[model samples]
Target: GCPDNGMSEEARQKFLEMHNSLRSSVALGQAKDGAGGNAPKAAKMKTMAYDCEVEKTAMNNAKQCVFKHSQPNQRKGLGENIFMSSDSGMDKAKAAEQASKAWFGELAEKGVGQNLKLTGGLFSRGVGHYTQMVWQETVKLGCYVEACSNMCYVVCQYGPAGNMMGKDIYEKGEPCSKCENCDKEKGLCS
Candidate 1:
């Protein structure tokens, strides 16, 4: 149905006149309040009242204006918005898993054994696969610079002979068997 006051020439002219009149009044009130004086407080209060009234009137007018100018057969609802309605719970879970895997893999590759030591409990319980994969990658990336055995642990020398040397253990002619720091008791390189 058409609005009670249709978009006729007279209605448009009336709207323009009301809008311009309110804008002029607001501008005048702001200018008056900007000038400080003995009566500045009273002028500011009056300006504030006018501004508040104008804002309220504008808000009230918006509802009527939208209704009056709206197209016929207008429909409203959150009917076809896919993001708001789609089930993304599974996607989020998969993404979180992938991120965890990547983080652990990188940590392991970068020789973050110290971090593993500190957060061993958390990593073991949470993302052990990632940590283990990273640890393996780290070992593969030149972590075998030292040697360890049940009796001794030592760093490999860098001469033509590549021998293991340390306080308790020393191999003069033998090549360095361990390439990383190791525990003498466990014979395991960290």
Candidate 2:
């Protein structure tokens, strides 16, 4: 099916435009403590306009930018993409808070911004061998990260399909409540 503009099959754009700012909170973890970089200014894309491919590109770039500027990593394998310590450390509530704040704090210190609001929530389902649950936040980086195994997934996102409630906020919506009782012992949620 083609989009309204009538492209039969739309392919994901390979790179973000230089003008597209990191429109939301950058998830911070996998701490690096150093690397020093040019601080980025904060800004957000409007609601109802976030996409997956765009978000992932933003995450990787922002990460590389900020970290080469401050710090975050991986020992990759079957888990192709990841955004935090493979060893999920912080508790659920504490983790997002830690993430949002870590990124915001670093950005601010670098003179990027002093505040960035984020709303987070958790979604669960019995996918198959493992019940999959995800923790996501609504911000705008052009909007996006992930994980694997009997694992706890942690990453930042922006321009989500909907608010943290996972609704398409095409007509105004609210973010979902915070995650509770997550098995931070593992990373996702209790």
Candidate 3:
């Protein structure tokens, strides 16, 4: 998934075919020591793993990552974003928002909120992992070359930025052209 809605598995697999590995010979030759001094080697799956305990420990980092971040957003005036502010209504924001909605709606005590602790726990285990999977898959497809010129990771929405990742990185929430025709209507982007 290039964010939320993604290319099909076949599409992703096909995309991977075009995209191979990034540890090219030139870069590999230029590899400096310390940072592995060598090119990175390239690399999954299943539905029958019932060992919840094992999986839980393996993915605690993402849960921690999201938890550490989500709390700040919940601070006095921080991450309380209800809706995405994308002119294009970024697929990234949408996926996050959807995940959030489902997340926020489930209250431990019957309320309209989310338990960041619990949310983090779940996010680390599944949602976050899923996001990684999407990236892994897309990158696997790609133009194969490490060159952005080939549109390696375009159409991606896996960051703080909103709407379409490939469009304009800054076109989020902020008033601008195309959002509401503010470019020429006169009263918007002032």
Candidate 4:
């Protein structure tokens, strides 16, 4: 009953690559903190894996095409980020990249502070998306995209969701310092 909207395997790969790339940037202390200096590195940044169950949940919200969040009960224990664009013809993979970039852009555009702490103020400032993307403990990712009449909608869902009321988005330290088996080159933990 839904339209032709659906995500491809290529699109899914792009989502994971982009997210892990961005996480790597933060883990290596290369991302700007939006203050005046580099953000701290991560002690252990886990690589995100794609999840079909999470994508199904995200698809449900995307099918609504309302540019709003799904009810909490709908996506229990999963964090969600939604994006919309006016161009309906955007390619699925491109849309996926653009949406993820925009979400990560919050760190540079709005600033999340050097502390990497997730607080009420962070959400109030509209940077929760960035935090959720890089939340150290969040290891699963699922996303969906829907093209409405004249717009494109993107939704990404995370498992072991991030952005708790009061918690560090990630533990800061030398890259992979706390990881058992680290990909020093990628700054990811196994």
TM-score of each: 0.16, 0.24, 0.16, 0.95
- Pairs in steric clash, model 3: 15-141, 16-140, 16-141, 19-144, 73-79, 85-173, 90-163
lDDT of 3 by residue, 27-126 (tens): 1222122223321211111011112222222123222322222333222221111212223223332333343333222222222111112244343343
- Candidate 4 segments exceeding 4 Å error: 1-5
Tens digit of per-residue lDDT, candidate 4, span 29-146: 8998775677788999999988888998999999888999888889999999999999997998999999999999988888877776776777799888898999999999999988
The alpha-carbon deviation from the true structure for residue 35 of candidate 1, after best TM-score superposition, in angstroms, is: 18
Least accurate 10 contiguous residues by lDDT in model 3 = 41-50
The lowest-lDDT stretch of 10 consecutive residues in candidate 1 is: 39-48
Query: What is residue 137's positional error in candidate 4, in angstroms?
Result: 0.6
- C-alpha RMSD of each candidate structure in angstroms: 37.3, 18.0, 22.3, 2.6
Which candidate, 2 or 4, would have the higher TM-score against the true structure?
A: 4
Give stretches of model 1 more than 4 Å off: 1-6, 30-190
In order, candidate lDDTs are 0.22, 0.25, 0.23, 0.89
Mark the 10 consecutive residues where model 4 has the least summed lDDT: 1-10
Instruction: Identify the superior model by lDDT, candidate 2 or candidate 4.
Output: 4
lDDT rank order: 4, 2, 3, 1
Question: How does candidate 3 score on lDDT?
Answer: 0.23
- The residue ranges of model 3 lying beyond 4 angstroms of the native Cα positions read 1-6, 17-20, 29-154, 157-190
